[PDB]
Every structure is written in structure tokens, then in C-alpha cells.
Nucleic acid binder design. Structure first.
Ligand code: MG
Ligand code: MG
Ligand code: MG
Ligand code: MG
Ligand code: MG
Ligand code: MG
Ligand code: MG
Ligand code: MG
Ligand code: MG
Ligand code: MG
Ligand code: MG
Ligand code: MG
Ligand code: MG
Ligand code: MG
Ligand code: MG
Ligand code: MG
Ligand code: MG
Ligand code: MG
Lengths: 210, 147, 51
RNA sequence: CAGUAACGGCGAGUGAACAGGGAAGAGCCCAGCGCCGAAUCCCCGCCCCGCGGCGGGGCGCGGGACAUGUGGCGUACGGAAGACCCGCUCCCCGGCGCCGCUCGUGGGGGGCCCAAGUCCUUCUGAUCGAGGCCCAGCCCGUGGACGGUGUGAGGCCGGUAGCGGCCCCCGGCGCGCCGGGCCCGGGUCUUCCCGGAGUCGGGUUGCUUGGGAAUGCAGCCCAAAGCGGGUGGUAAACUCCAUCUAAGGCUAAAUACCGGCACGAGACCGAUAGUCAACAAGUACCGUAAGGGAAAGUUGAAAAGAACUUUGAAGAGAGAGUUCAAGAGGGCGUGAAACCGUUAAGAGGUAAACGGGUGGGGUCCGCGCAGUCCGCCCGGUUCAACCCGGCGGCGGGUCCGGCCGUGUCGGCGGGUCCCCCGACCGGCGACCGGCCGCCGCCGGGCGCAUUUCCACCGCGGCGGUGCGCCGCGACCGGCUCCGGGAC
RNA sequence: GACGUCGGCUACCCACCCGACCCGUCUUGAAACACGGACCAAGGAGUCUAACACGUGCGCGAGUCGGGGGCUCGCACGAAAGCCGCCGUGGCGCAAUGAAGGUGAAGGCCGGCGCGCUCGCCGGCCGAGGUGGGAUCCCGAGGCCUCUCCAGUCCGCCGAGGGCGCACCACCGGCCCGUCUCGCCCGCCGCGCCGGGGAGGUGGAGCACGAGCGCACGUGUUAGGACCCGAAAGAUGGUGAACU
RNA sequence: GGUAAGAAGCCCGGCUCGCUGGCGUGAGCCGGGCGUGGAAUGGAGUGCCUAGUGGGCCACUUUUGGUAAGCAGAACUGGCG
RNA sequence: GGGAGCCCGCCCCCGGAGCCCCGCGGACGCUACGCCGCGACGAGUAGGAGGGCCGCUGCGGUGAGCCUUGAAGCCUAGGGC
């Protein structure tokens, strides 16, 4: 029963909710088990990074963000072809590869190719056998480091470019942002109807000819 | 703490603070929001006007990302940049007019609320309002549209 | 910035040596028994098993 | 995201998905299309190895399956074959043994072990109690958890801590050998090839969903195509765009775990509680059956569980004995109330019982063989007074000197964080070294009109009181009256 | 007055005078010929989670936060505690108004350019308006005096009177969004069924120099078993013709 | 049963008006001058949460129905509750 | 500070004026969540609020706490608050 201006509330407790109550007393044990598994997996691959394969540079959809850069699932086949790495070979050296990712922009392609080249530059390819075959690094850069790479490999940072103070001219001052936005919205709304009217006028002229 | 609660002071009292004429029954008026139209209508109509009825158009698949457009007023615009940038203004005898990017700070729309200090600025934003643009032009700045 | 004196360190057998350490500013922080009691009472419940 | 978009006698109510941040992260295989002499697979015989999760090789015109299609290449991320640009040739399976004992800091399982008081008195039935023992005490301590032992034990015992030890089994990672299988690339160009049908889809009806001219699943009917098909959250036509390739299949990790095996813990309950079940509990018992389902822990440190004498047929007693205690005697620790017997006292014709006020009798309590209660001031053996030395402390300012320390000014000397001297000021309890005055203690003097303890005759001055029963006087405050005079 | 005498308000028993009907509950009304009640012991009924609203305390503050995750211990005390380019993905708040397409919070003064046209355009100045009541603060004549008359800087109390005026209240103005009426002009990449501006009413959970965030405590309303005990019912799955 | 018994009141001077008007009104803005406004008693104003209640009864007086009622039903005030 | 009054000077400090005020330091009184002085008031069902050195159980600290020379529990015509 309501009483002198309370909120109208609709709790979702009409089912047998007490049957399916999920407690969280397992949380510290779960965290400890996850940490132990992570440490064991890191120890299993002694020189390889604990984080895993390198991830590409990805920009987010959904204009809400539209500007953040995060790690992708894997490098596209076009990026591998430009960088010169076989798709089947790449997964064996620690490079994430997925075949679903398209490539629309040149900037992202070039950034990912540069990232792949930078990763290849700082890569220590151990020989398959104690004897050193082709493409294996020298023994000098093998005893120098054999430890894990803590954290993500080449961490992704959303970097912005600082703009120097300008010398603003009269052309920028005369620009009307609000009017331009309103005109652009009106043009976008009326493009199709104006095209229809122009077509109708053209048909009127053609029927006047005959 | 049940020690500090009212139930400790009600020991020895027959009705336990719920009256002896009208007892504490299960649900004298009904469960939940029952009776919004009958026998509870006065409360709903004098505390929640517009509860009953339907108004407006439906939007089946609504996505909040499309309608995402944070707004910032001109009252607090120099706060997005470091204080030394504002200190390096009305100075250097050149009219530097430092550029302020609101999309970097997480804003798309610039509104005209507040008073803008007399210093030229370069403001880059997804959208601008008429009053904000008027204030910026009057101060001596320029509005730049960024996609 | 309250007045922080110098505290003399002591060796393994007493007999304070020549080394001195200025009092850290933490020891000049305000004493709030109510805040300490509140924090202690609320934090001591976190190591409690359900029954 | 989000109690949101949406659904709902648009009422009650119901109610997702995308993106974002994380945990984990692993990709692949067929049919078809085509090229290789079926190049493929199963079974039975013999030989060699090992055979306790029956495999590998060889020898068999020994059988069978398979052309109504096995195997090799190859699957949407394109593929196959030639052309000729580039650098070159180790992965897996089954055994034979071998060194490193492989993180809870020696991987898993099991077994045997590793420090120090029963020290001196003293309680007790029995100490693990109490006092003391080269420093909280005697020794160890990387061991001061726990349990048992006649109480309450770090050192009596088992254990506890330890990158402590030894003895067996198992698991896993690596080395040399044997049997083997394996002649296995990348980029460009050229020529061909490239798709799962009663399926999609449409109508329908029923169920379901937030999905609303129908989200998904369906019985029935219709029923395809290949620049095709599906999707783009309002039904339809036209028109461009964006995104996948359905109707074939496999795959660990982050996830769940009121059953099972073996462990750890608790601000949980403590025998009408906690599981029904602390115990011969799903037992006794009830119902034809499906099923229903209890109550019930405690002697004592140790049975040392009462020998023996006596009355009684015996159950039962009286003695005796054990034990610290049977005033613990086999449903025996402590033993309340309701209720009952007896003993002692009181009382009793308006049922008993109750509140206020007294009286009488008992129970013990506190005195007392007067209780006249003390505590200060006054009268009737050494040191204070006063000096010398030592020790410690207090306060002060010329800030006497330095450190310490707050704000500004100076040297920019190293936005915020540090160095040097000088000046002013707050000199702020942030410290000293000297000076002054004072206080206390110790050691020397100071021998007795001062000084200090004990006991008395003074009730002399002050304060709180009297062992109990009392009485009297004066003063004040508030009342009830009485006798006079005068207007 | 002191070896069978003292004091013991309360409790042990008895007697006397006055008062005095059995408790709990429904009820206008109970001692009721209204209901429950032989007696005693033990157990026994407003709890917990979640969502709100207000009040209170604490920390930070136009910011606040720890959800989840990660790094330190092999868990005695610990499933604690400490930390994070995770310090903020994200929530809440900082902006509201329309069904929506969308729009979106400051004006005033001074001089000039169009005819100051209560309208448009150029430069400078002040930067949340004004009125009334307003706790407190500022100035303050003068008085009170002081061992005698005068002069007199100072330490005071009162101080008529005059002001700046917190918070808050009431009113008059101003601004933002939707809508109605009357209208005059501005701009262009595309001169259009383009876009923008004014005045006067009205509708809004708004602005008008901010106050929230997190934790904890209490109260009140709910969903849950919901303070405890209580039905006549309904549904699902099984067992019985040893009576009849 | 409503009002009035003064400071939120009066008396002057000047501005504004797309209202109304022959001049005028009427309203709103600023400046200045005048204080115990009948008796007696009270310190007031304002904002949030908020339980219980929502079966009543009796009496003086007025009063409706009924022959009347310890009957049923109203008004003021006071009580029991 | 000067001029003077019904011959000049002093007219002094509490480590002492000794007090009904001592502005020089200040309780026997100061658990300032403490103490002290004035006045008025005291009904209560439903209900609300405050204080409990009222009572029970367990946890973190603290009583160099109590205890086999006797803990809890139980009984009591004993002494009290
Ligand atoms: Mg990760
Ligand atoms: Mg929300
Ligand atoms: Mg084939
Ligand atoms: Mg023991
Ligand atoms: Mg022990
Ligand atoms: Mg031992
Ligand atoms: Mg549509
Ligand atoms: Mg039981
Ligand atoms: Mg017994
Ligand atoms: Mg009833
Ligand atoms: Mg009745
Ligand atoms: Mg009664
Ligand atoms: Mg009965
Ligand atoms: Mg009880
Ligand atoms: Mg409420
Ligand atoms: Mg029931
Ligand atoms: Mg029914
Ligand atoms: Mg009543």
C-alpha cells in the first residue's frame, strides 16, 4: 500500500529466487586458483611472453567511443602479406592471426604492418636444435635474456597529437559552424525529395518537347 | 545492530506497536501496487501524475551509442586544458589562441552557458550551438568542426 | 607543517648511536578515535565465515 | 549496459540484446569439384619384440569389404597443375636403458625418526597449582598450535617448526641406442575448378519470446534459384548500398557442482538445541501399501563395584569395609519447581489470598560487661633555624652563544619539492652550555629555653558525632485560637 | 541504663482497623450467566536479503566510488590486509526540454553605422538583476567619568543615528526547451517546400556562481515464508476390491 | 458570522506606459518627511519524516420518525472511551 | 602635562594588603558528556521518543583480574543497596 509520496517500485522477486541465490564466498579462492594457474602457465613457457601472442591495433565501432584504440583478435591476412609473414608460420612464432577481419582503411593497415615489423625486429627466434640453423638468432642474444615478458606485448596506448597555437586568420573567424550544421542537416533530409522534384521538372520539359 | 533497534523496546507491550483495535494483518490493502485505479486512486493521482496511459512513439531496437553526445558549457572550458596553457594567454604579444579539443576530454557538443574570459580560443567539436559560437566569436576565437 | 623533532636510533644493546631521524609527518596527523573505531569495527567483519 | 529498448485486461507485472572493461584464448576436418593402375580398410596362419590400458614389422596367389567409391592432394582464409624468382633438407610413433628426485619452496602416495625441568620447597586424593632457581624467573625456541597424562603443562608423551634426515612405489620433463614412417617449401604469373532440396522461402495454425502486420520452434499445404540466397527490429513495390555463405562434422580454457572419496576452518548449536538420528537410527514401532517414524549422553582419578557378621523365603534392612567424597552404590555428576511424608513454631466459625498502619512472638545480625567516638592547635632520642661541600630540579631575561624552529626579504645559488649568511618579527614548552634566584636530598657541623616520638591532667579553642530511651530552653517559618485596649 | 537487657525500617508467623471482585482479550460498555486458563519446568513469535524516501555521523568534494580484475603468501592469526598508466571502463552528479525530427540556459551600460525603428550591425566597460524583511559586521555624534581648573593623545560601556548587507522567504524582471498569434529582416558551396533571428501569452520535474558521491546507523513503505499459529480448496505422481 | 482599530500607514516631488483618455486617467518605478494607533493575556514563525485511528457512547440545551423505549437519527458544548 | 586648593617631600611592593574583593596565581567545585543556582510543572489507553552503572550469549582489546587455601550452578527465618 502506498503512503504519502513514495516511489512506485516493482521488485523482481515474484519467482522462487531463493532457490537460485549465487553467493560469492568463492571469490578469494577463485582468484588464488587463477593466479596459481597463470603462474604455472607462465613457467611452462619459460622464455615466451606470459600474456601470449601479439595483438593488433583496433579502433572501436559505435560512435559513442569512436576514438579509443584497443587490442584486436589478430592481424588480417592482408597485413601479413604486406609484412611478408606466412599465415601458418605466424601462429607458431607468437603472432595472432584471424581470417575474418577486413581492411577498409590504409592507415590501420600501415599501422599494423609497422607494428608487425617492430615486433619482428625485437624477436629472439631460438634455434629448433642446439645447433643453430638458418633464421636463428646468435647465441649472444640468447643468454642475455630468457625471462618472461610481463604484461601485454607492446602495450596499446591511445596517443593524441598536440596542436601548436595558431595565427588565426579572418577566414576561420568568418566560418559559421551552427549555420553549416543546420544547412547540412537540411540537405541530408531533403536530398531525395529535391531529386524527385528535379526529375519531375525534367519529365515536364520532355513532355513539353513532344 | 538489532540492539539499537525498536524491537528491543517493545518487549512487554501486547500489540508490539501495531495497535490493538486494528491488528497487523497480512495485506489489508493488497499486494504491491494493487488498486491504482480502485481504492488507491487518490495516492496515485496526487503523488504520481501521469502514471496511467500511453504517450509517444515506440522505438523497437534502440541503441544508446548512436544518441551518445556529451555536452560541455563555456562556463568551464579552460578546465579541459592545463592551467599553464591559460597562463600563457594574454601574453607573448602574438595572440597565440591555444587550441582546445573537447573530443579529447570526452565531449561532443559545446553549449553556451556561462561567461567566457576575454581570450581568443580555438575550439574543435563535433557540434556547436548558436549562443556558444556567438560567445566564441565575440571573445575573438573561432569554431572548428571535426568529424 | 608542524614542528617535527629528531628521533635518535638505538643499537642492539640500547646506547643510542649518533644516527638521528627526523620525525615523519604521519606522527603529527590528527587523532580521531571515532574514525579509528568505525574503520576497525567495519573491517573486522571481513574475516568472518558464514553460518 | 539495465530494471533500459520492448512486452502487458499498457493493469498487476514481465523484460533482453549491442558496444565498452576483463578471465581465458586454438583452430580445424568432410561431401561435392577434380588428379593418382583401390594407390584403401578388416579378419585368420607363421616368425621377431614387448606383451596387467594386444601394438609394430616381415613372410602368406589365405579370405572378405570396396568402383552403388576406400585412401593421398585439397574446403571458402580460395584450391589444383605448369612456368621459373629465391634458401635449403628433421618431425613423429613403439621399445631398450641412463643421469638429474622435478617449487611451497623435494612433484604425488606410504613407512621410521630428529630440542628443552618431572629442578628445590609447598598445597592436594591426585598438579599440569603457588613461591623460587646466573636476565620472566632453570633450559629449548626456524619448535609459546593441539591432544592425552588422577586439575590450569613450551620443556612427561605423541606431535608442533625446519631449502630436516632415511627407506620404497608412482607420475612428469630430458639423454644414447634399436625398429621404423617421412624426398615433406615461400612469392609472382598463366590455365582450369569452386558448394550440402521436401532444404530455404511463402501461407497456416499451435506453443514460446522483450521481439511488437508475427522472436524462435513446429503439424499441414505450396515449394525454389544461382552476379543466387540470408540479414539490415513496421507490412509492400522500385532502387542502390553494407555484411555473411545456411540446410555436413570435431575441438581443451576461463564456467557449475546441497551426490561420492579425502582434508581444512568457524564471532555457528551445545542433548526439548544442532541433521530424524552425539547412543545397537532410517533402529524400535505403526499401516495391506505407497509410506510414517521416535525416546534415549554423564558413578568414580582408579571398580578400588561394598569381603565379612546379623534379621528376613526373598525383595529388602542393621553393622563393617573402599574412596577426598556413596551426603557419588550399576539410568549412580550437579539435583531447582510443581507435589508428598515427617519434625519445630504460629494460627484457625464469614473460602483462600492482597494493599496501607501498628502491635505481639521467633530467626539470627551489630554491639556492649560504658560505646562514651576521634582528628588538629594550646597549657602543664635527634635535628630544623644558620652555615660548608656535593647531587638533582624549577623559572627568568641581557637571547648571554650555538642548535631548533615559523612568515617575509637576499644569493636562482639545486609549477611543486632543497641549500648559505644577514635583518625583522611569532622566540612558538623544539634543545642545550654558562649566570642569577629558589626548592629538595645526602654528608659535616649546630648539645639543647629551639627541634622531634610515646603516655597522662586539662572536655581549654575548632570540626564531624552521641550505644539506646529521653526531657528542657531560646530563635525562626507556616497555621488554628484566646484576652485586651483605641478609631 | 546495661549480662538476659539494647537497635534491626526490609523479610518468618499471628492479630487488629480501614481499603480491597480474576487475570489477558474483543468491546461504547467485563468481576461477569463473554471467551483462554489444574499446577510446575524448558522452548516460543517483528528476523534476513533487495529496492526506495527522510533524518543523523564520517571521508573526499565538482567531483566521488570501488563493482569486477590484476600484483604481494606457502591461509596460524587470512579466505584478512596493502597497492594499481587498472583512479576509472562503468554507475551517480555536473543541463534541461519535446512524441520525435531536434534544440539547448546572460544579460546590462556607453559611443558609432541604418531613421536608435523598443529592430539589425560595429568597439569598450560591469560581469548572475531589482524591491521589502533580514542574524551578524562597519562608521558613529555624544554621554558616563576619572581627588580641584584647563589641555589631552589612550584602555573602556552605552551609544541616538547612518551603511555593506549571509542564509531564507514574498514579489517584480531576465534566460533555456515545446506550443500559439503578429510580423520585419539576415547568410550561403549548392538561392530552395533552405537555414537563423524579434515581440507578445502560455506549458516544463529547468538556469539564474554548484553539492554531490561512498560508507555506516535509525525510522517508514514494499517484494519476498515476511511477527507466530490456523482453513473449506486446487494440481502432479503413486498405493489399495484382506471390509464392502 | 465577516471586516477595521496604522510603518506592509499617511503627506509631498519627479519619471515610465504598444492600457484608457479632449485636456485626463489608472498602474508601476525612484527621492524626501512624519512612529507607542481600543482593553487585557501571550514569545513567535517555518520545514521534513511520522505511528495509531477511520465500530463509539452518555448528558444540559435545540430537534426529526415513532404511542413509547435503556429505540433510531442530527446541531453546540462537556464528559466516559 | 600645566596651573592650583578647602613650607617642602612622601602618597612605596601583596613572596606580603591579609582579606565580603585582591584586575599578581587561583577550588574542597573542574569524570566541562563535570559541577552549581534559580523558578514552574508532574493523569493516561492506542501510539511516538529518550535514558538504563537493567538482564543473556559470543567476538576484538583491557583488568601483572578471580579460582582445588575452591569456578559455574543450586538452597537460605542471614546483612543491605
Ligand atoms: Mg588476459
Ligand atoms: Mg541506472
Ligand atoms: Mg573422395
Ligand atoms: Mg591436559
Ligand atoms: Mg600443553
Ligand atoms: Mg618432546
Ligand atoms: Mg523498416
Ligand atoms: Mg535431538
Ligand atoms: Mg544424582
Ligand atoms: Mg473484531
Ligand atoms: Mg456488544
Ligand atoms: Mg477483564
Ligand atoms: Mg477451560
Ligand atoms: Mg524461557
Ligand atoms: Mg515513507
Ligand atoms: Mg497452513
Ligand atoms: Mg480453482
Ligand atoms: Mg476502544
Amino acid at each position: 500500500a502506498p503512503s504519502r509520496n513514495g516511489m512506485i517500485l516493482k521488485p523482481h522477486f515474484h519467482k522462487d529466487w531463493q532457490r537460485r541465490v549465487a553467493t560469492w564466498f568463492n571469490q578469494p579462492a577463485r582468484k588464488i586458483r587463477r593466479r596459481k594457474a597463470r603462474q604455472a602457465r607462465a613457467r611452462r613457457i619459460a622464455p615466451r611472453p606470459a600474456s601470449g601472442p601479439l595483438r593488433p591495433i583496433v579502433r572501436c565501432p559505435t560512435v559513442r567511443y569512436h576514438t579509443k584504440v584497443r587490442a584486436g583478435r589478430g592481424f588480417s591476412l592482408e597485413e601479413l602479406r604486406v609484412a611478408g609473414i606466412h599465415k601458418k608460420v605466424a601462429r607458431t612464432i607468437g603472432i595472432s592471426v584471424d581470417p575474418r577481419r577486413r581492411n577498409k582503411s590504409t592507415e590501420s593497415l600501415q599501422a599494423n604492418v609497422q607494428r608487425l615489423k617492430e615486433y619482428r625486429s625485437k624477436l629472439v627466434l631460438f634455434p629448433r636444435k642446439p645447433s643453430a640453423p638458418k633464421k636463428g638468432d646468435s647465441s649472444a642474444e640468447e643468454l642475455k635474456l630468457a625471462t618472461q615478458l610481463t604484461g601485454p606485448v607492446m602495450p596499446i596506448r591511445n596517443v593524441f597529437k598536440k596542436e601548436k597555437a595558431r595565427v588565426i586568420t579572418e577566414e576561420e573567424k568568418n566560418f559559421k559552424a551552427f549555420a553549416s550544421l543546420r544547412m547540412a542537416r537540411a540537405n541530408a533530409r531533403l536530398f531525395g525529395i529535391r531529386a524527385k522534384r528535379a526529375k519531375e521538372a525534367a519529365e515536364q520539359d520532355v513532355e513539353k518537347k513532344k | 545492530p538489532s540492539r539499537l533497534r525498536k524491537t528491543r523496546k517493545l518487549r512487554g507491550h501486547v500489540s508490539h506497536g501495531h495497535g490493538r483495535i486494528g491488528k497487523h494483518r497480512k495485506h489489508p490493502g493488497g499486494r504491491g501496487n494493487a488498486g491504482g485505479m480502485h481504492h488507491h486512486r487518490i495516492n496515485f493521482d496526487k503523488y504520481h501524475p501521469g502514471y496511467f496511459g500511453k504517450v509517444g512513439m515506440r522505438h523497437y531496437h534502440l541503441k544508446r551509442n548512436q544518441s551518445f553526445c556529451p555536452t560541455v558549457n563555456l562556463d568551464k572550458l579552460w578546465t579541459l586544458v592545463s592551467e599553464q596553457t591559460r597562463v600563457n594567454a594574454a601574453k607573448n604579444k602574438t595572440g597565440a589562441a591555444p587550441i582546445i579539443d573537447v573530443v579529447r576530454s570526452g565531449y561532443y557538443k559545446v553549449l553556451g552557458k556561462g561567461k567566457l574570459p576575454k581570450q581568443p580560443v580555438i575550439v574543435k567539436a563535433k557540434f556547436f550551438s548558436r549562443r556558444a559560437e556567438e560567445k566564441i566569436k565575440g571573445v575573438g576565437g573561432a569554431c572548428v568542426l571535426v568529424a | 607543517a608542524c614542528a617535527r623533532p629528531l628521533i635518535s636510533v638505538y643499537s642492539e644493546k640500547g646506547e643510542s648511536s649518533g644516527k638521528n631521524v627526523t620525525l615523519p609527518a604521519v606522527f603529527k596527523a590528527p587523532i580521531r578515535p571515532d574514525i579509528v573505531n568505525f574503520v576497525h569495527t567495519n573491517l573486522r567483519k571481513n574475516n568472518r565465515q558464514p553460518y
